[model samples]
Target: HHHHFNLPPGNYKKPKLLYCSNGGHFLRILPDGTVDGTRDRSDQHIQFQLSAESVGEVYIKSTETGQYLAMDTDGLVYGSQTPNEECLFLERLEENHYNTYISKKHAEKNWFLGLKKNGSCKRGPRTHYGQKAILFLPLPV
Candidate 1:
């Protein structure tokens, strides 16, 4: 399955909703309530509340297509961007938690995607972790 959309030249926007797997990188479900994806880890998301594991949640805005990919010891949120195109990748580097790595390609594709996971060892962890991909779009004139 896939999704497609096109924003006007300007109209910068942020992800209205957040989507993720279930039970973590071990288990997951699509927004349609389909139990799919890998399940090697639990505790999918950790935002205002732990909604990524038990039930899926959407952002405050709206979107066309979204997907969450969870690999063994890993998870990724494609967000409302191009289908199957991930914006974030979470790697379980420790017990009961994981680290985030945003896609530079996605950020380059859309400034809105921002530099979540740029190849910057100097940026440090303070700039990473639970970061948003679409929150960095350039300010519209």
Candidate 2:
């Protein structure tokens, strides 16, 4: 599918909210690769810069600290200032306006940005009934 946004290229004005699947907590990224999902929108941990990069690519940045959500060589997710292939993700739209972000790299194809039971971030296979891999809910513009 053509993933190009009708709007002009670059960063979007507002950030998007990421809701966790396990306990319905918001997703948060830390420098230590400790993903938290217990935070709420008021905390800014759930806020992310959903920037458009190309027709099928985008960058997810932390609104709290301006760090981008990126995966490392160890298949772990973390916050990074430098842009790399690991930071780029594709929007895999699902039902009810929910979506799963798939890494653009071939090595990390099966690994998805999922959350653990404790709200920490982890990379896991995109298997059936994968709730942690689910993210993004319809927000008012």
Candidate 3:
């Protein structure tokens, strides 16, 4: 299926904000390599470098800390200093017109990048298609 993130190269320099509409939070990667959400989207931590890796796959890297967003086998989300298998994600456009990220390393289990109600990390194992927590609207910054 066609995806949502394979955009023109010029847009990468513009930066992007992954807004979790379900939780009303912006995905942020802290300097300490922590991945979380924040209501305040002004910080550099909230900006991401969305690099397409393959068809419908991309690497979500933190612009502030230079870390790649990674999801472990336990279905927990975090950031890694370097790119690895866990750092790759399938950026798919859902029927709802929003995007849901699935872990490339854990595609068999359908572990998704998700955020909980209070902007906390949503376990990958607990995620599924059509779930609001997994839905993210990418906003240009």
Candidate 4:
């Protein structure tokens, strides 16, 4: 299949990964705004649209479910139909090609959008960047 992230004003989708034998899983946004991990690109729940909110910030939403990625006061990350400040994320570019998406909420700044070792999506501590929360590379169609 041919998939391309048009970039900028264009909406983008975050698919798991592409490499050698061992493949990565995609972050699926559930109907109720809950996030999960999977390897099925055919699933619309895994597609997200990331729009720039500012020079270094962006809002992530689900293309299929129409839910926004948000974090609660307790640092829990999920998709919400209502957009709010908790949905804003700071897109930090790293020395490596990957980027780090930090929560804009002060309470969640130390936490970033991350995938668990099992491929589940969650808010992870910033200290685990290299080991946990690195942004997934945009796959070329």
Highest-lDDT candidate: 3
Cα lDDT tens digits, model 4, 47-113, are: 6677777766778777777898887776677888888998987766543555556677742346666
Better structure of 2 and 4 per lDDT = 2
Alpha-carbon shift of residue 126 in model 4 (angstroms):
7.5
**lDDT-best of 3 and 4:** 3
Which 10-residue window of candidate 1 scores lowest in summed lDDT? 46-55
| Candidate 2: pairs in clash | none
Q: Taking the candidates one at a time, how many backbone clashes does each contain?
A: 14, 0, 0, 1
Candidate 1 total steric clashes: 14
lDDT of 3 by residue, 22-140 (tens): 88999999998888899996777998888877766789988788899999878889999999999998887765567778898898788889888899988888898778898888898
User: Tens digit of lDDT per residue, candidate 2, span 1-141?
Assistant: 323223222335677677755567677776564565764656646678787788547788876777888777667677787778888877666554566666666333455677776666765443223464455452422
Q: Write the per-residue lDDT of candidate 1 for residues 1-141, one digit (tens) a residue.
A: 011122222121332112222122222334552323232333332111111211111121112223332211122232232222332332122112322223323332221211233311112223333354222221111
How many clashes would you count in candidate 4? Answer: 1
Model 2 residue 90 distance off true place after TM-score fit, in angstroms: 0.6
lDDT-based ranking: 3, 2, 4, 1
What is the lDDT of every predicted structure here? 0.25, 0.63, 0.83, 0.60
Q: What is the lDDT of candidate 3?
A: 0.83
Q: What local lDDT does model 1 show for residue 86?
A: 38
Q: What is the lDDT of residue 8 in candidate 4?
A: 28
Q: What is the TM-score of each candidate against the true structure?
A: 0.19, 0.74, 0.89, 0.74
Candidate 3 has its poorest 10 consecutive residues by lDDT at 1-10
Candidate 1 local distance difference test against the native: 0.25
Prediction 2 global C-alpha lDDT:
0.63
